[PDB]
Amino acid sequence: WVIP
Amino acid sequence: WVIP
Amino acid sequence: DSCIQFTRHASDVLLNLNRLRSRDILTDVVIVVSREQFRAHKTVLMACSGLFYSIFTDQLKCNLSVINLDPEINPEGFCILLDFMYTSRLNLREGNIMAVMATAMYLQMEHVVDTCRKFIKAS
Amino acid sequence: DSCIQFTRHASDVLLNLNRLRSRDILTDVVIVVSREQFRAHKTVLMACSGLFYSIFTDQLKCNLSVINLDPEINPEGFCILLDFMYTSRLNLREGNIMAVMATAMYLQMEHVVDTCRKFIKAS
Ligand SMILES: CN(C)c1ncc(Cl)c(Nc2ccc3c(c2)CC(=O)N3)n1
Ligand SMILES: CN(C)c1ncc(Cl)c(Nc2ccc3c(c2)CC(=O)N3)n1
Ligand SMILES: [Cl-]
Ligand SMILES: [Cl-]
């Protein structure tokens, strides 16, 4: 999971 | 396009 | 093999499937969550959820145009997860994380359950 | 928004859609190319091809279970492109590049046409  |  | 690969292809496919959903094009099922109705593509639901995968591979349920979820399922939690299925983006907030995790456990969306468990452990 | 994103989600969705295709699950159309028949999901075809997008948004053609392609279309070129749609992988070879480019131009798959033009220009 990432900060888009 | 890339070499997978 | 000796194939070449287009990096953005999968993301572009999902973006177009979401555009079809937003215009209600070729949607073939309505998911009923309490009073709320959500139109979707059976194939996308199956590709994202262990529960829908089991439902739509069943020889009788594969033909249903309406699926009713367990009354304990929260419509907002479902809406956030349906958006995630079609975008890869999860709107996880303090006020919805418990409903999102419970819905993801029911829908069998392992990666969402994992990030909810980690975000809860941090707080 | 304040969303988080699962990097591998789109790729995982496409991988599952290809698994459904390989097992012939919820396929809703057969594409006829000369003597050859190819089963697929209308939504995936639309998401990948400007031609299928136009066909299946048409109020009459959207309901067809069989689509016949122009007799000039090569079944192998179509097969390579159908595999690309479901995998992001293109089996481009010296012996098939002309048939692949011609099929991609007909199917309106802009990114495939672009890489074929570049590979032809190099040789
Ligand atoms: C497991 N399998 C062969 C398969 N083939 C096709 C599809 Cl659409 C599919 N989808 C599915 C099954 C289980 C799970 C998911 C999708 C997501 C998840 O967390 N569990 N799973
Ligand atoms: C253009 N548009 C709004 C849209 N919405 C939904 C879908 Cl499924 C779609 N697909 C499509 C249309 C044109 C093209 C492609 C897909 C690939 C391409 O090279 N051209 N295009
Ligand atoms: Cl997931
Ligand atoms: Cl393309």
PDB file of C-alpha atoms and ligand atoms in Angstrom:
ATOM      1  CA  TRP A   1       0.000   0.000   0.000  1.00  0.00           C
ATOM      2  CA  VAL A   2       1.194   3.553  -0.913  1.00  0.00           C
ATOM      3  CA  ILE A   3       0.142   7.235  -0.759  1.00  0.00           C
ATOM      4  CA  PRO A   4      -0.917   7.742  -4.448  1.00  0.00           C
TER       5      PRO A   4
ATOM      6  CA  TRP B   1       6.961  -1.072 -22.889  1.00  0.00           C
ATOM      7  CA  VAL B   2       9.512  -3.180 -20.905  1.00  0.00           C
ATOM      8  CA  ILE B   3      11.236  -6.603 -20.867  1.00  0.00           C
ATOM      9  CA  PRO B   4       9.177  -8.313 -18.070  1.00  0.00           C
TER      10      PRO B   4
ATOM     11  CA  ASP C   1       8.587 -16.388 -23.394  1.00  0.00           C
ATOM     12  CA  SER C   2      10.083 -13.498 -25.488  1.00  0.00           C
ATOM     13  CA  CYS C   3       7.070 -11.147 -24.774  1.00  0.00           C
ATOM     14  CA  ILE C   4       7.291  -7.347 -24.200  1.00  0.00           C
ATOM     15  CA  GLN C   5       5.033  -5.782 -21.560  1.00  0.00           C
ATOM     16  CA  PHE C   6       3.011  -2.537 -21.387  1.00  0.00           C
ATOM     17  CA  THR C   7       3.456  -1.341 -17.760  1.00  0.00           C
ATOM     18  CA  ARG C   8       0.241   0.763 -17.638  1.00  0.00           C
ATOM     19  CA  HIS C   9      -2.057  -1.804 -19.368  1.00  0.00           C
ATOM     20  CA  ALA C  10      -3.680  -3.327 -16.208  1.00  0.00           C
ATOM     21  CA  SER C  11      -4.295   0.159 -14.667  1.00  0.00           C
ATOM     22  CA  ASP C  12      -5.796   1.419 -18.003  1.00  0.00           C
ATOM     23  CA  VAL C  13      -8.063  -1.689 -18.193  1.00  0.00           C
ATOM     24  CA  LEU C  14      -9.323  -1.073 -14.618  1.00  0.00           C
ATOM     25  CA  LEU C  15      -9.853   2.658 -15.338  1.00  0.00           C
ATOM     26  CA  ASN C  16     -12.041   1.732 -18.364  1.00  0.00           C
ATOM     27  CA  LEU C  17     -13.992  -0.879 -16.378  1.00  0.00           C
ATOM     28  CA  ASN C  18     -14.700   1.835 -13.777  1.00  0.00           C
ATOM     29  CA  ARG C  19     -15.845   4.202 -16.614  1.00  0.00           C
ATOM     30  CA  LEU C  20     -18.251   1.434 -17.767  1.00  0.00           C
ATOM     31  CA  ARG C  21     -19.532   1.033 -14.168  1.00  0.00           C
ATOM     32  CA  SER C  22     -20.077   4.828 -13.804  1.00  0.00           C
ATOM     33  CA  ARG C  23     -22.168   4.857 -17.048  1.00  0.00           C
ATOM     34  CA  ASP C  24     -23.940   1.586 -16.028  1.00  0.00           C
ATOM     35  CA  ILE C  25     -22.634  -0.174 -19.203  1.00  0.00           C
ATOM     36  CA  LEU C  26     -22.830  -4.014 -19.312  1.00  0.00           C
ATOM     37  CA  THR C  27     -23.402  -4.241 -15.528  1.00  0.00           C
ATOM     38  CA  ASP C  28     -25.054  -7.636 -14.967  1.00  0.00           C
ATOM     39  CA  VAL C  29     -25.801  -7.729 -11.233  1.00  0.00           C
ATOM     40  CA  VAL C  30     -27.217  -5.590  -8.422  1.00  0.00           C
ATOM     41  CA  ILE C  31     -25.778  -6.123  -4.912  1.00  0.00           C
ATOM     42  CA  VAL C  32     -28.383  -5.301  -2.254  1.00  0.00           C
ATOM     43  CA  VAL C  33     -26.964  -4.064   1.097  1.00  0.00           C
ATOM     44  CA  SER C  34     -29.797  -3.243   3.548  1.00  0.00           C
ATOM     45  CA  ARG C  35     -31.906  -0.661   1.620  1.00  0.00           C
ATOM     46  CA  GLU C  36     -29.023   0.245  -0.790  1.00  0.00           C
ATOM     47  CA  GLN C  37     -28.456  -1.134  -4.311  1.00  0.00           C
ATOM     48  CA  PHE C  38     -25.094  -1.285  -6.127  1.00  0.00           C
ATOM     49  CA  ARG C  39     -24.747  -2.158  -9.809  1.00  0.00           C
ATOM     50  CA  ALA C  40     -21.548  -3.943 -10.882  1.00  0.00           C
ATOM     51  CA  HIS C  41     -19.882  -6.418 -13.257  1.00  0.00           C
ATOM     52  CA  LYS C  42     -19.871 -10.008 -11.910  1.00  0.00           C
ATOM     53  CA  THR C  43     -16.352 -10.620 -13.360  1.00  0.00           C
ATOM     54  CA  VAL C  44     -14.832  -7.621 -11.522  1.00  0.00           C
ATOM     55  CA  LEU C  45     -16.540  -8.675  -8.243  1.00  0.00           C
ATOM     56  CA  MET C  46     -15.104 -12.220  -8.684  1.00  0.00           C
ATOM     57  CA  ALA C  47     -11.620 -10.888  -9.535  1.00  0.00           C
ATOM     58  CA  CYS C  48     -11.566  -8.876  -6.257  1.00  0.00           C
ATOM     59  CA  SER C  49     -13.496 -10.954  -3.737  1.00  0.00           C
ATOM     60  CA  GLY C  50     -13.264 -14.557  -2.527  1.00  0.00           C
ATOM     61  CA  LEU C  51     -16.974 -14.384  -1.595  1.00  0.00           C
ATOM     62  CA  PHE C  52     -18.163 -13.245  -5.080  1.00  0.00           C
ATOM     63  CA  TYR C  53     -15.766 -15.712  -6.700  1.00  0.00           C
ATOM     64  CA  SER C  54     -17.507 -18.573  -4.774  1.00  0.00           C
ATOM     65  CA  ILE C  55     -21.012 -17.144  -5.517  1.00  0.00           C
ATOM     66  CA  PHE C  56     -20.634 -16.652  -9.267  1.00  0.00           C
ATOM     67  CA  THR C  57     -18.828 -20.005  -9.885  1.00  0.00           C
ATOM     68  CA  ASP C  58     -21.872 -21.721  -8.363  1.00  0.00           C
ATOM     69  CA  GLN C  59     -23.940 -23.315 -11.195  1.00  0.00           C
ATOM     70  CA  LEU C  60     -27.230 -21.791  -9.801  1.00  0.00           C
ATOM     71  CA  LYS C  61     -26.077 -18.428  -8.354  1.00  0.00           C
ATOM     72  CA  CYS C  62     -24.012 -17.569 -11.515  1.00  0.00           C
ATOM     73  CA  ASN C  63     -27.408 -16.783 -13.217  1.00  0.00           C
ATOM     74  CA  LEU C  64     -28.837 -14.465 -10.531  1.00  0.00           C
ATOM     75  CA  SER C  65     -29.212 -10.749 -11.408  1.00  0.00           C
ATOM     76  CA  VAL C  66     -29.725  -9.829  -7.692  1.00  0.00           C
ATOM     77  CA  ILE C  67     -27.489 -10.808  -4.706  1.00  0.00           C
ATOM     78  CA  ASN C  68     -28.552  -9.877  -1.149  1.00  0.00           C
ATOM     79  CA  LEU C  69     -25.721  -9.485   1.376  1.00  0.00           C
ATOM     80  CA  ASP C  70     -25.952 -10.413   5.078  1.00  0.00           C
ATOM     81  CA  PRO C  71     -28.041  -7.692   6.946  1.00  0.00           C
ATOM     82  CA  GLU C  72     -25.025  -7.022   9.269  1.00  0.00           C
ATOM     83  CA  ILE C  73     -23.108  -5.547   6.268  1.00  0.00           C
ATOM     84  CA  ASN C  74     -22.902  -1.761   6.305  1.00  0.00           C
ATOM     85  CA  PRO C  75     -23.768  -0.064   2.891  1.00  0.00           C
ATOM     86  CA  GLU C  76     -21.007   2.580   3.319  1.00  0.00           C
ATOM     87  CA  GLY C  77     -18.342  -0.085   4.029  1.00  0.00           C
ATOM     88  CA  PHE C  78     -19.536  -1.938   0.902  1.00  0.00           C
ATOM     89  CA  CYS C  79     -19.487   1.269  -1.208  1.00  0.00           C
ATOM     90  CA  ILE C  80     -15.850   2.021  -0.127  1.00  0.00           C
ATOM     91  CA  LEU C  81     -14.846  -1.567  -1.028  1.00  0.00           C
ATOM     92  CA  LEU C  82     -16.682  -1.531  -4.380  1.00  0.00           C
ATOM     93  CA  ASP C  83     -14.831   1.731  -5.232  1.00  0.00           C
ATOM     94  CA  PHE C  84     -11.518   0.010  -4.236  1.00  0.00           C
ATOM     95  CA  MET C  85     -12.312  -2.956  -6.529  1.00  0.00           C
ATOM     96  CA  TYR C  86     -12.673  -0.634  -9.528  1.00  0.00           C
ATOM     97  CA  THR C  87      -9.849   1.845  -8.691  1.00  0.00           C
ATOM     98  CA  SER C  88      -7.162   0.229  -6.362  1.00  0.00           C
ATOM     99  CA  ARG C  89      -7.903   3.244  -4.045  1.00  0.00           C
ATOM    100  CA  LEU C  90      -9.206   2.659  -0.505  1.00  0.00           C
ATOM    101  CA  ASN C  91     -10.909   5.527   1.371  1.00  0.00           C
ATOM    102  CA  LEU C  92      -9.851   4.320   4.841  1.00  0.00           C
ATOM    103  CA  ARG C  93     -10.754   6.758   7.683  1.00  0.00           C
ATOM    104  CA  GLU C  94     -10.972   6.564  11.520  1.00  0.00           C
ATOM    105  CA  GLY C  95     -14.796   6.701  11.267  1.00  0.00           C
ATOM    106  CA  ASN C  96     -15.137   3.855   8.753  1.00  0.00           C
ATOM    107  CA  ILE C  97     -12.163   1.466   9.407  1.00  0.00           C
ATOM    108  CA  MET C  98     -14.182  -0.958  11.615  1.00  0.00           C
ATOM    109  CA  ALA C  99     -17.044  -1.211   9.028  1.00  0.00           C
ATOM    110  CA  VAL C 100     -14.489  -1.493   6.146  1.00  0.00           C
ATOM    111  CA  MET C 101     -12.502  -4.316   7.892  1.00  0.00           C
ATOM    112  CA  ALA C 102     -15.747  -6.247   8.793  1.00  0.00           C
ATOM    113  CA  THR C 103     -17.018  -5.903   5.167  1.00  0.00           C
ATOM    114  CA  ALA C 104     -13.582  -6.945   3.728  1.00  0.00           C
ATOM    115  CA  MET C 105     -13.507 -10.037   6.019  1.00  0.00           C
ATOM    116  CA  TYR C 106     -17.032 -10.999   4.820  1.00  0.00           C
ATOM    117  CA  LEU C 107     -16.115 -10.307   1.148  1.00  0.00           C
ATOM    118  CA  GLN C 108     -12.794 -12.208   1.601  1.00  0.00           C
ATOM    119  CA  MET C 109     -10.550  -9.339   0.376  1.00  0.00           C
ATOM    120  CA  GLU C 110      -7.331 -10.451   2.121  1.00  0.00           C
ATOM    121  CA  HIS C 111      -5.120  -7.409   1.250  1.00  0.00           C
ATOM    122  CA  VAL C 112      -7.752  -4.915   2.549  1.00  0.00           C
ATOM    123  CA  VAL C 113      -8.145  -6.969   5.794  1.00  0.00           C
ATOM    124  CA  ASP C 114      -4.313  -6.876   6.222  1.00  0.00           C
ATOM    125  CA  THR C 115      -4.030  -3.044   5.877  1.00  0.00           C
ATOM    126  CA  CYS C 116      -7.045  -2.502   8.233  1.00  0.00           C
ATOM    127  CA  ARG C 117      -5.410  -4.768  10.889  1.00  0.00           C
ATOM    128  CA  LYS C 118      -2.122  -2.780  10.571  1.00  0.00           C
ATOM    129  CA  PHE C 119      -3.855   0.655  10.760  1.00  0.00           C
ATOM    130  CA  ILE C 120      -5.866  -0.504  13.842  1.00  0.00           C
ATOM    131  CA  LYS C 121      -2.679  -1.903  15.528  1.00  0.00           C
ATOM    132  CA  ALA C 122      -0.931   1.520  15.006  1.00  0.00           C
ATOM    133  CA  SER C 123      -3.723   3.407  16.891  1.00  0.00           C
TER     134      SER C 123
ATOM    135  CA  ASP D   1      -8.825  12.536  -1.555  1.00  0.00           C
ATOM    136  CA  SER D   2      -7.051  10.910   1.475  1.00  0.00           C
ATOM    137  CA  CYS D   3      -7.127   7.365  -0.123  1.00  0.00           C
ATOM    138  CA  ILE D   4      -4.338   4.727   0.164  1.00  0.00           C
ATOM    139  CA  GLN D   5      -3.541   2.599  -2.894  1.00  0.00           C
ATOM    140  CA  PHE D   6      -2.690  -1.098  -3.402  1.00  0.00           C
ATOM    141  CA  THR D   7       0.024  -1.074  -6.125  1.00  0.00           C
ATOM    142  CA  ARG D   8      -0.608  -4.663  -7.348  1.00  0.00           C
ATOM    143  CA  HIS D   9      -4.459  -4.470  -7.376  1.00  0.00           C
ATOM    144  CA  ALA D  10      -4.960  -3.767 -11.143  1.00  0.00           C
ATOM    145  CA  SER D  11      -2.441  -6.518 -12.140  1.00  0.00           C
ATOM    146  CA  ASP D  12      -4.139  -9.014  -9.719  1.00  0.00           C
ATOM    147  CA  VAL D  13      -7.594  -8.113 -11.165  1.00  0.00           C
ATOM    148  CA  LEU D  14      -6.333  -8.729 -14.741  1.00  0.00           C
ATOM    149  CA  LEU D  15      -4.659 -12.018 -13.693  1.00  0.00           C
ATOM    150  CA  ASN D  16      -8.013 -13.232 -12.252  1.00  0.00           C
ATOM    151  CA  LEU D  17      -9.947 -12.120 -15.350  1.00  0.00           C
ATOM    152  CA  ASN D  18      -7.478 -14.154 -17.447  1.00  0.00           C
ATOM    153  CA  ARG D  19      -8.028 -17.175 -15.095  1.00  0.00           C
ATOM    154  CA  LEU D  20     -11.804 -16.793 -15.710  1.00  0.00           C
ATOM    155  CA  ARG D  21     -11.182 -16.648 -19.497  1.00  0.00           C
ATOM    156  CA  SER D  22      -8.974 -19.800 -19.386  1.00  0.00           C
ATOM    157  CA  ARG D  23     -11.771 -21.716 -17.540  1.00  0.00           C
ATOM    158  CA  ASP D  24     -14.455 -20.165 -19.835  1.00  0.00           C
ATOM    159  CA  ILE D  25     -16.218 -18.582 -16.790  1.00  0.00           C
ATOM    160  CA  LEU D  26     -18.800 -15.813 -17.476  1.00  0.00           C
ATOM    161  CA  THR D  27     -17.542 -15.322 -21.063  1.00  0.00           C
ATOM    162  CA  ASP D  28     -20.442 -13.685 -22.926  1.00  0.00           C
ATOM    163  CA  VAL D  29     -19.232 -13.413 -26.528  1.00  0.00           C
ATOM    164  CA  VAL D  30     -17.469 -15.418 -29.240  1.00  0.00           C
ATOM    165  CA  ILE D  31     -15.272 -13.481 -31.710  1.00  0.00           C
ATOM    166  CA  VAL D  32     -15.150 -15.262 -35.078  1.00  0.00           C
ATOM    167  CA  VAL D  33     -11.929 -14.708 -37.102  1.00  0.00           C
ATOM    168  CA  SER D  34     -12.045 -16.667 -40.396  1.00  0.00           C
ATOM    169  CA  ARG D  35     -12.640 -20.292 -39.242  1.00  0.00           C
ATOM    170  CA  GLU D  36     -11.390 -19.603 -35.650  1.00  0.00           C
ATOM    171  CA  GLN D  37     -13.538 -18.834 -32.581  1.00  0.00           C
ATOM    172  CA  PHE D  38     -12.375 -16.937 -29.471  1.00  0.00           C
ATOM    173  CA  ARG D  39     -14.417 -16.718 -26.274  1.00  0.00           C
ATOM    174  CA  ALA D  40     -14.037 -13.551 -24.177  1.00  0.00           C
ATOM    175  CA  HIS D  41     -15.651 -11.057 -21.787  1.00  0.00           C
ATOM    176  CA  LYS D  42     -17.270  -8.087 -23.594  1.00  0.00           C
ATOM    177  CA  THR D  43     -16.128  -5.677 -20.811  1.00  0.00           C
ATOM    178  CA  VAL D  44     -12.444  -6.667 -21.160  1.00  0.00           C
ATOM    179  CA  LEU D  45     -12.647  -6.351 -24.986  1.00  0.00           C
ATOM    180  CA  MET D  46     -14.179  -2.842 -24.572  1.00  0.00           C
ATOM    181  CA  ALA D  47     -11.561  -1.819 -21.976  1.00  0.00           C
ATOM    182  CA  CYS D  48      -8.742  -2.722 -24.432  1.00  0.00           C
ATOM    183  CA  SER D  49     -10.081  -1.906 -27.887  1.00  0.00           C
ATOM    184  CA  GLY D  50     -11.633   1.187 -29.474  1.00  0.00           C
ATOM    185  CA  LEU D  51     -13.410  -1.104 -31.976  1.00  0.00           C
ATOM    186  CA  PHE D  52     -15.059  -3.338 -29.303  1.00  0.00           C
ATOM    187  CA  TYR D  53     -15.861  -0.255 -27.226  1.00  0.00           C
ATOM    188  CA  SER D  54     -17.848   1.166 -30.219  1.00  0.00           C
ATOM    189  CA  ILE D  55     -19.488  -2.248 -30.948  1.00  0.00           C
ATOM    190  CA  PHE D  56     -20.686  -3.057 -27.432  1.00  0.00           C
ATOM    191  CA  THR D  57     -21.947   0.506 -26.658  1.00  0.00           C
ATOM    192  CA  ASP D  58     -24.218   0.171 -29.701  1.00  0.00           C
ATOM    193  CA  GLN D  59     -27.827  -0.426 -28.492  1.00  0.00           C
ATOM    194  CA  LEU D  60     -28.280  -3.395 -30.957  1.00  0.00           C
ATOM    195  CA  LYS D  61     -24.777  -4.960 -31.072  1.00  0.00           C
ATOM    196  CA  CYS D  62     -24.417  -4.884 -27.217  1.00  0.00           C
ATOM    197  CA  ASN D  63     -26.837  -7.915 -27.179  1.00  0.00           C
ATOM    198  CA  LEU D  64     -25.027 -10.086 -29.756  1.00  0.00           C
ATOM    199  CA  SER D  65     -23.339 -13.295 -28.504  1.00  0.00           C
ATOM    200  CA  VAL D  66     -21.356 -13.647 -31.800  1.00  0.00           C
ATOM    201  CA  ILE D  67     -19.184 -10.967 -33.525  1.00  0.00           C
ATOM    202  CA  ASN D  68     -17.612 -11.701 -36.936  1.00  0.00           C
ATOM    203  CA  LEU D  69     -14.423  -9.770 -37.738  1.00  0.00           C
ATOM    204  CA  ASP D  70     -13.428  -8.546 -41.222  1.00  0.00           C
ATOM    205  CA  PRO D  71     -12.159 -11.584 -43.325  1.00  0.00           C
ATOM    206  CA  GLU D  72      -8.775  -9.784 -43.817  1.00  0.00           C
ATOM    207  CA  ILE D  73      -8.047 -10.238 -40.059  1.00  0.00           C
ATOM    208  CA  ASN D  74      -5.525 -12.971 -39.316  1.00  0.00           C
ATOM    209  CA  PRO D  75      -6.589 -15.413 -36.454  1.00  0.00           C
ATOM    210  CA  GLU D  76      -3.006 -15.609 -35.068  1.00  0.00           C
ATOM    211  CA  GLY D  77      -2.683 -11.790 -34.923  1.00  0.00           C
ATOM    212  CA  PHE D  78      -6.044 -11.695 -33.099  1.00  0.00           C
ATOM    213  CA  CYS D  79      -4.983 -14.473 -30.672  1.00  0.00           C
ATOM    214  CA  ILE D  80      -1.736 -12.568 -29.784  1.00  0.00           C
ATOM    215  CA  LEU D  81      -3.778  -9.381 -29.179  1.00  0.00           C
ATOM    216  CA  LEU D  82      -6.460 -11.161 -27.119  1.00  0.00           C
ATOM    217  CA  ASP D  83      -3.654 -12.625 -24.935  1.00  0.00           C
ATOM    218  CA  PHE D  84      -2.200  -9.064 -24.568  1.00  0.00           C
ATOM    219  CA  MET D  85      -5.622  -7.726 -23.482  1.00  0.00           C
ATOM    220  CA  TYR D  86      -5.785 -10.250 -20.632  1.00  0.00           C
ATOM    221  CA  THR D  87      -2.077 -10.207 -19.600  1.00  0.00           C
ATOM    222  CA  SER D  88      -0.328  -6.880 -20.661  1.00  0.00           C
ATOM    223  CA  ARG D  89       2.176  -9.213 -22.473  1.00  0.00           C
ATOM    224  CA  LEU D  90       2.641  -8.953 -26.253  1.00  0.00           C
ATOM    225  CA  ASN D  91       4.247 -11.858 -28.156  1.00  0.00           C
ATOM    226  CA  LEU D  92       5.764  -9.657 -30.890  1.00  0.00           C
ATOM    227  CA  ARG D  93       8.050 -11.561 -33.336  1.00  0.00           C
ATOM    228  CA  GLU D  94       9.576 -10.862 -36.799  1.00  0.00           C
ATOM    229  CA  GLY D  95       7.154 -13.410 -38.333  1.00  0.00           C
ATOM    230  CA  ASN D  96       3.988 -11.918 -36.822  1.00  0.00           C
ATOM    231  CA  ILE D  97       4.651  -8.125 -36.436  1.00  0.00           C
ATOM    232  CA  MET D  98       2.895  -7.158 -39.723  1.00  0.00           C
ATOM    233  CA  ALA D  99      -0.254  -9.225 -38.856  1.00  0.00           C
ATOM    234  CA  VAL D 100      -0.174  -7.927 -35.220  1.00  0.00           C
ATOM    235  CA  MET D 101       0.109  -4.227 -36.317  1.00  0.00           C
ATOM    236  CA  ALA D 102      -2.711  -4.638 -38.952  1.00  0.00           C
ATOM    237  CA  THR D 103      -4.976  -6.346 -36.338  1.00  0.00           C
ATOM    238  CA  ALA D 104      -4.150  -3.659 -33.680  1.00  0.00           C
ATOM    239  CA  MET D 105      -4.978  -0.858 -36.186  1.00  0.00           C
ATOM    240  CA  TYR D 106      -8.341  -2.555 -36.958  1.00  0.00           C
ATOM    241  CA  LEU D 107      -9.041  -3.163 -33.224  1.00  0.00           C
ATOM    242  CA  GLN D 108      -7.947   0.442 -32.414  1.00  0.00           C
ATOM    243  CA  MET D 109      -5.315  -0.544 -29.794  1.00  0.00           C
ATOM    244  CA  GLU D 110      -3.190   2.631 -30.010  1.00  0.00           C
ATOM    245  CA  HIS D 111      -0.305   1.555 -27.682  1.00  0.00           C
ATOM    246  CA  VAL D 112       0.219  -1.753 -29.584  1.00  0.00           C
ATOM    247  CA  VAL D 113       0.192   0.140 -32.949  1.00  0.00           C
ATOM    248  CA  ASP D 114       2.845   2.550 -31.522  1.00  0.00           C
ATOM    249  CA  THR D 115       5.265  -0.239 -30.404  1.00  0.00           C
ATOM    250  CA  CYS D 116       4.815  -2.118 -33.751  1.00  0.00           C
ATOM    251  CA  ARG D 117       5.651   1.101 -35.701  1.00  0.00           C
ATOM    252  CA  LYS D 118       8.804   1.600 -33.540  1.00  0.00           C
ATOM    253  CA  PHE D 119       9.964  -2.056 -33.893  1.00  0.00           C
ATOM    254  CA  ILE D 120       9.413  -1.886 -37.708  1.00  0.00           C
ATOM    255  CA  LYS D 121      11.310   1.475 -37.940  1.00  0.00           C
ATOM    256  CA  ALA D 122      14.308  -0.116 -36.060  1.00  0.00           C
ATOM    257  CA  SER D 123      14.622  -2.960 -38.654  1.00  0.00           C
TER     258      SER D 123
HETATM  259  C1  LIG E   1      -8.369 -18.773  -6.671  1.00  0.00           C
HETATM  260  N1  LIG E   1      -8.656 -18.689  -8.150  1.00  0.00           N
HETATM  261  C2  LIG E   1      -8.151 -19.825  -8.977  1.00  0.00           C
HETATM  262  C3  LIG E   1      -9.349 -17.575  -8.737  1.00  0.00           C
HETATM  263  N2  LIG E   1      -9.619 -17.567 -10.101  1.00  0.00           N
HETATM  264  C4  LIG E   1     -10.381 -16.567 -10.577  1.00  0.00           C
HETATM  265  C5  LIG E   1     -10.879 -15.578  -9.750  1.00  0.00           C
HETATM  266 CL1  LIG E   1     -11.879 -14.424 -10.364  1.00  0.00          CL
HETATM  267  C6  LIG E   1     -10.542 -15.614  -8.361  1.00  0.00           C
HETATM  268  N3  LIG E   1     -10.847 -14.586  -7.533  1.00  0.00           N
HETATM  269  C7  LIG E   1     -10.699 -14.523  -6.112  1.00  0.00           C
HETATM  270  C8  LIG E   1     -10.666 -15.636  -5.236  1.00  0.00           C
HETATM  271  C9  LIG E   1     -10.258 -15.517  -3.895  1.00  0.00           C
HETATM  272  C10 LIG E   1      -9.864 -14.236  -3.457  1.00  0.00           C
HETATM  273  C11 LIG E   1      -9.883 -13.099  -4.326  1.00  0.00           C
HETATM  274  C12 LIG E   1     -10.296 -13.212  -5.648  1.00  0.00           C
HETATM  275  C13 LIG E   1      -9.390 -11.893  -3.577  1.00  0.00           C
HETATM  276  C14 LIG E   1      -9.067 -12.474  -2.190  1.00  0.00           C
HETATM  277  O1  LIG E   1      -8.588 -11.906  -1.213  1.00  0.00           O
HETATM  278  N4  LIG E   1      -9.383 -13.857  -2.194  1.00  0.00           N
HETATM  279  N5  LIG E   1      -9.781 -16.611  -7.869  1.00  0.00           N
HETATM  280  C1  LIG E   2     -13.144   6.710 -24.363  1.00  0.00           C
HETATM  281  N1  LIG E   2     -13.958   6.201 -23.199  1.00  0.00           N
HETATM  282  C2  LIG E   2     -14.740   7.230 -22.451  1.00  0.00           C
HETATM  283  C3  LIG E   2     -13.966   4.816 -22.812  1.00  0.00           C
HETATM  284  N2  LIG E   2     -14.763   4.396 -21.753  1.00  0.00           N
HETATM  285  C4  LIG E   2     -14.833   3.075 -21.515  1.00  0.00           C
HETATM  286  C5  LIG E   2     -14.140   2.161 -22.286  1.00  0.00           C
HETATM  287 CL1  LIG E   2     -14.326   0.550 -22.012  1.00  0.00          CL
HETATM  288  C6  LIG E   2     -13.307   2.649 -23.341  1.00  0.00           C
HETATM  289  N3  LIG E   2     -12.468   1.828 -24.016  1.00  0.00           N
HETATM  290  C7  LIG E   2     -11.676   2.127 -25.168  1.00  0.00           C
HETATM  291  C8  LIG E   2     -11.946   3.149 -26.112  1.00  0.00           C
HETATM  292  C9  LIG E   2     -10.993   3.555 -27.064  1.00  0.00           C
HETATM  293  C10 LIG E   2      -9.739   2.910 -27.030  1.00  0.00           C
HETATM  294  C11 LIG E   2      -9.442   1.880 -26.081  1.00  0.00           C
HETATM  295  C12 LIG E   2     -10.386   1.470 -25.148  1.00  0.00           C
HETATM  296  C13 LIG E   2      -8.029   1.409 -26.286  1.00  0.00           C
HETATM  297  C14 LIG E   2      -7.547   2.302 -27.442  1.00  0.00           C
HETATM  298  O1  LIG E   2      -6.438   2.347 -27.965  1.00  0.00           O
HETATM  299  N4  LIG E   2      -8.614   3.151 -27.834  1.00  0.00           N
HETATM  300  N5  LIG E   2     -13.228   3.970 -23.592  1.00  0.00           N
HETATM  301 CL    CL E   3      -7.922  -7.178  -1.445  1.00  0.00          CL
HETATM  302 CL    CL E   4      -3.164  -0.861 -26.606  1.00  0.00          CL
END
